[PDB]
Design a binder for this molecule. Structure first.
Ligand code: NA
Lengths: 151, 194
C-alpha cells in the first residue's frame, strides 16, 4: 500500500508458492514484521524471475481481516497504480473476531471462478499480497500461507 | 387520489400503517422481516409516504428469483383492504396506494403512496441503512467510509483495495455491523438527520 508497509523479495530459484512459503517462515521477514507492529496494513511483494500465469489462489490467514492479491508486470516499470487486481480484497475476519482473536486462521481457496478473469488470463512477475487488519493493529497479523497454482 | 399523495402522513398514522404491514407480514410467515424506513424510521413527526423493506431468509443474492415472496405480501394487504391500488408491480419492488381502515360512520383516511421492496437477506441491513437516510447522513457516512477504505452503497459494504478496487461484499447481520467496519460509533436510526 506504500513502500514502508511493503516487504519486497526476489524469488530467484523458486516459484511464487515456494518464494512465499520461504518468505513467511523467514527470520528476516519475521523481524521486519515485528518492526511494523501497530500497523493497520502490510504487504509483501514477490518478484518472480519467470513471469507466471496464476490459475487459482489458496490463502491461509494469520490474523488478517482482509487479504488482497494484485499482480504486476515489471518490464517497462511498475508503480503502485500499475498493479492489476488478481484476487479482490477478501474477508477473513470480522471486526468482532479481529478484536476477540477468534478464528484468526481461516483458509479460503479461490479458483479461476473467484479471481478477476482479465487478470488471471495474463502472466505476471510481480505478486503483491496485501493484509489489512484495522481492528487489531498491534497483532503481528499476516498469512500462514498463500499458494498460487499454475499450468 | 391526486391531492391525497401530496398530503403529509402524521407519525400517528404511519404507526397504524406500520402495524398493519408488520402484522400481515408476520402472519404470512414469521421468517419475513419488514422494516418501515424513510424519515419515519428517523423519527420524523410526519412522512410523505411509506417505504417498506421486505426480506426473507429464503431470498438471498445467490438464490433464484422469488417474486412470490413479494406478491404474496402485496396480495394479502389487498385482501385486508390496506393496499387500495397498484401503480407498479415489479418482481422486487411494489409501488402502490394504501389506506387505513375507518369505521362504518368514521371519516375515511387519505390514500397514501407505499413502496414495498423485496431485498436479499444478505443485503438487507445495507438497504435499511440506505433507505433510512437521511440523504445528508448517507452522504456523510459514505464519505467517512471511503476515507477508511470502504465503499457503502444500497446493497453492500465492500473493502477498497490498494488500487481502489472494491472487494467482496462483507457479511452484515445488522446496521451496527456496518458502522463497525468503518469504525464509526453507531448512530441510532433517530439520530441520523445529518
Ligand atoms: Na509494465
Amino acid at each position: 500500500p506504500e513502500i514502508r508497509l511493503r516487504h519486497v523479495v526476489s524469488c530467484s530459484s523458486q516459484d511464487s508458492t515456494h518464494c512465499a512459503e520461504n518468505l513467511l517462515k523467514a527470520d528476516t521477514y519475521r523481524k521486519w514484521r515485528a518492526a511494523k507492529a501497530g500497523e493497520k496494513t502490510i504487504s509483501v511483494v514477490l518478484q518472480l524471475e519467470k513471469e507466471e500465469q496464476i490459475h487459482s489462489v489458496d490463502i491461509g490467514n494469520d490474523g488478517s481481516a482482509f487479504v488482497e492479491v494484485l499482480v504486476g508486470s515489471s518490464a517497462g516499470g511498475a508503480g503502485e497504480q500499475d498493479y492489476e487486481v488478481l484476487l479482490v480484497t477478501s474477508s477473513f475476519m470480522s471486526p468482532s473476531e479481529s478484536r476477540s482473536g477468534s478464528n484468526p486462521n481461516r483458509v479460503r481457496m479461490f479458483g479461476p471462478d473467484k479471481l478477476v478473469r482479465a487478470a488471471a488470463e495474463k502472466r505476471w512477475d510481480r505478486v503483491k499480497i496485501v493484509c489489512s487488519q484495522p481492528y487489531s493493529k498491534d497483532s503481528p497479523f499476516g498469512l500462514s500461507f498463500v499458494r498460487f497454482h499454475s499450468p | 387520489y391526486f391531492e391525497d399523495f401530496e398530503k403529509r402522513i402524521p407519525r400517528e398514522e404511519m404507526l397504524q400503517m406500520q402495524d398493519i404491514v408488520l402484522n400481515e407480514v408476520k402472519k404470512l410467515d414469521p421468517e419475513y422481516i419488514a422494516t418501515v424506513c424513510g424519515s419515519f424510521r428517523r423519527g420524523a413527526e410526519s412522512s410523505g409516504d411509506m417505504d417498506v423493506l421486505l426480506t426473507h431468509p429464503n431470498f438471498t443474492s445467490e438464490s433464484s428469483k422469488q417474486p412470490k415472496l413479494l406478491h404474496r405480501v402485496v396480495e394479502q394487504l389487498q385482501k385486508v383492504r390496506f393496499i387500495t391500488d397498484t401503480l407498479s408491480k415489479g418482481e422486487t419492488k411494489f409501488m402502490g396506494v394504501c389506506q387505513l381502515p375507518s369505521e362504518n360512520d368514521e371519516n375515511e383516511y387519505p390514500h397514501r403512496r407505499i413502496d414495498i421492496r423485496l431485498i436479499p437477506k444478505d443485503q438487507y441491513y445495507c438497504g435499511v441503512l440506505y433507505f433510512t437516510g437521511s440523504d445528508i447522513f448517507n452522504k456523510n457516512m459514505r464519505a467517512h467510509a471511503l476515507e477508511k477504505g470502504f465503499t457503502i452503497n444500497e446493497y453492500t459494504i465492500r473493502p477498497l483495495g490498494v488500487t481502489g478496487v472494491a472487494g467482496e461484499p462483507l457479511p452484515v447481520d445488522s446496521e451496527q455491523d456496518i458502522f463497525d467496519y468503518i469504525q464509526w460509533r453507531y448512530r441510532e436510526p433517530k439520530d441520523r438527520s445529518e
